[PDB]
């Protein structure tokens with residue numbers, strides 16, 4: 001695993017600032033709640049696997065050995081979301097937000113609405 005600090009996440013996610021109207025603090029909050037800042041996090045379910053900081057699934061967003069019949073919307077191999085370069089992770093996160101919305105990560109819960117200044121570095 002590779003856990004980052006809150007400040008490292010803040011700096012690394014700069015390019016997501018205000019994307020879709022989501023402020024930087026919200027992205028950091030999303031990252032904390034999604035993978036605890038672990039860029040190598042992998043979570044398995046019966047029919048799918050989620051990868052990295054943004055926990056992008058191999059059912060619709062990326063392709064891996066477990067599911068080669070993935071829609072591969074982000075057109076990339078999931079293992080790409082397990083390294084130190086968040087560049088492609090960010091490119092794909094924007095698509096998820098554009099397409100499904102912030103609830104891909106929040107699941108209808110208001111986990112990143114109050115005291116947002118707490119997620120600032």
Ligand SMILES: [Ca+2]
Nearest residue numbers: 080081085086
């Ligand atoms: Ca990456």
